[PDB]
Structure 1
């Protein structure tokens, strides 16, 4: 047989007993027509479920104002909650642990996606410059956001709280707060975006206030052992960089310690220039640490051997390998992924048609 590897080692996380450390990263696939989870997702998630394996669902919108892309699922209506149930049930049928990633795009939207054509909301009133859409043909334009007022913010915090409850109602084992990639929560944390002059800005502490109020509200709502949060301190995605990423990341993990969460999920920096690294954050964080961003089998085992993380989340390789955990375990060849169908809308093509090991 093949030598055992750290990636296949059981891991205790929060109140859960995982059977291995290969995690399905959150992956927006834009196949949730009308913002409603679809039948084909039942198969998609089921194909990737393993006994005791952790699955993090695609970013799920917490309210009407959090929409910034077509066909992404939401979880603010009964219809969406009910549509989520069969998908969650399929994952549970195979013994998987399923966390719902709750999300709000903030300024990364257009009034055409908004209720009554309203302006997107954000920590600031500055908009994004145009971006080339996933199809590589069309250009996405964004509407300048309306700066949320100090007293409006708690209402948004409550939207995350309600979304978390709805996820529990749908049967999810827990929720992951989307505090990354320049979306609403990251907009408040990043100093290139947050130019507020009230208590939600002006200092590292103030910029992280929003994220921490969300953690508290969500943790108090469903229990901290059913809560995780994802951050990307070093990412500049959606024009959301920070002048001191290391300090930002350190402050967040140190502040998150007191909440006793199920885990903290951090994305690796794209480049190393003090220097960008997740090691200091792993050392400062006392709970379960999940890393993601460019990992393969070799790097995944190495991260565990060097004790840089407890869990390793895989995105692209999991898109093309339903049975990624098994393949890693057998050190089997991997299917290549086709980025051209990552965000296309077919129920099957590039979604459920990647083959299992022969």
Structure 2
């Protein structure tokens, strides 16, 4: 039965009936051409509608934002129409869903960029990693990332407008909230990190300059819709996709959080460590974050129901986002509430493919 995990929580403009959230999970099953959400994806989300809040897989704000074959977009008419069906299905089950919007930046490949050109980023530095494309049969494959082109100063306003337009589209698509992907080494994080950002204009250098882009985006989207409809995900501590949060990560993190707090947005989603290792957050750091943000705080990263209850009980976080447990358990809320066993995970089908390993996991 637990304690607080199953109690309501006001998240900006909506109210979650429990604090068990579904973390944003890239599954790469969209239709190409078009990067269009599918009926299968609709069923997948609908099966998980009992979550306090569903945060969708990362979705492109524009065609240029694309970095993975199979990832959906929210910039075209066909994409908007498809997502409207998915959010409607979730609402039909009385759930709530937020769309995570991103721009992959340098974690992309020229073959899936508009015109087949090099992807963009803060600086012209290859991420030295791989991304996922699809072969001639539609199967997911890994490929080395393409060296990016540094965005020109005059191109930044366009990036901000793309985020603004995507939120406008999200609103029409029926999403309850939007989550800006400012983590895991993607575009916004590429600007935030001193290791991936070597710009000498006002978007590089000091933390104030490095956080400039993300804050302009936050302001742009709050103005487009409403601050209580805006959430943001950050991974300010540690190293992700070869992007390292500088030698002053903690100080820089608190600066960013205080600035975000000023906009009165719906929530702050903290991805504590990537799938690989990572130093755990100290309660002291959690307290410092807590006192700087006045909205909902979501914790994520190998959480257990026990850890969630502990931190929620200490008043350090308000909700917990589960990723892999949600992939394998559509009715995770019921299972954690009943203290039931969970379905075993099948990692080989996390990315790409079809129904198997997707709408495949049974409910109690």
Normalising by the residue count of structure 1, what TM-score does the alignment of the two structures yield? 0.94
Q: Which residue of 2 aligns with 1:36?
A: 36
Mapped pair 1:342 → 2:346: no
Between the aligned partners of 1:79 and 1:259, the Cα distance in structure 2 is 32
Match of 2:14 among 16, 21, 25: 16
1:55 corresponds to 2:54: yes
How far apart, CA to CA, are the structure 1 residues paired with 2:130 and 2:220?
Answer: 33
**Structure 2 unpaired stretches of 5+:** 135-139
Matched, 1:150 2:153: yes
Q: Tell me the residue number matched to 1:262.
A: 266
Q: Secondary structure at the match of 1:229?
A: strand
1:48 and 1:232 map into 2 onto residues whose CA distance is 25
Question: Residue 268 of structure 1 contacts residue 278 of structure 1 at CA under 8 Å; is this kept in 2?
Answer: no
8 Å Cα contact 2:2/2:309 also seen in 1 = no
Structure 2 residue matching 1:112: 3-state secondary structure: helix
Q: Deviations over 1:159-206 (max 9, x none)?
A: 000001111111111210000100000000011111110011110010
1:319 match: 327
The match for 1:181 is 184
Structure 1 window deviating more from structure 2 (118-127 vs 299-308): it is: 299-308
Runs of 4+ in 1 over 3 A off after TM superposition: 130-135, 273-279
| Structure 1 residue 280 displacement after superposition | 2.2
Q: Deviations over 1:253-292 (max 9, x none)?
A: 1111111111010111343289695442123212111110
2:129, 2:241 within 8 Å by CA — same for their partners in 1?
no
Post-superposition offset of 1:41: 1.1
Match status 1:284 vs 2:287 = no
Q: Deviations over 1:223-275 (max 9, x none)?
A: 01111010001242221112222112211111111111110101113432896
When the two chains are superposed, the root-mean-square deviation of aligned CA atoms in Å is 2.0
Tell me how far apart the structure 1 counterparts of residues 9 and 307 of structure 2 sit (CA, whole Å). 18
* Match in the other structure for 2:45: 45
Paired with 1:161 and 1:132, the residues of 2 have a C-alpha distance of 26
1:131 corresponds in structure 2 to 130
Query: How many residues align structurally?
Result: 353
Query: How many Å apart are 1:118 and its aligned residue?
Result: 1.3
Q: Does 1:354 align with 2:364?
A: no
Partner of residue 200, structure 1: 203
Where does residue 314 of structure 2 map in the other structure? 306
Superposition deviation, residue 10 in structure 1: 0.8
**1:216 CA displacement:** 0.3
Distance 1:112 1:264, change over 3 A: same
The separation in 2 between residues aligned to 1:180 and 1:232, in whole angstroms, is 5
Q: CA offsets, 1:274-321, max 9 Å, x none?
A: 969544212321211111000111111112112220011000000000
- For residues 287 and 273 of structure 1, do their structure 2 counterparts lie closer, same or farther at Cα, with a shift above 3 Å needed? closer
Structure 1 portions without partners, runs of 5+:
none
Match of 2:305 in 1: 297
Structure 2 Cα separation of the partners of residues 200 and 74 of structure 1:
26
8 Å contact from structure 1 (residues 199, 206) kept in 2: yes
- Looking at structure 2, the residues matched to 294 and 88 of structure 1 have their Cα atoms a distance apart, in angstroms, of 27
Q: Deviations over 1:61-85 (max 9, x none)?
A: 0111111111110011000000111
Distance 1:298-1:273 versus aligned 2 partners, 3 A rule: closer
CA contact 2:236–2:253 (8 Å) conserved in 1: yes
1:99 matched to 2:98? The reply is: yes
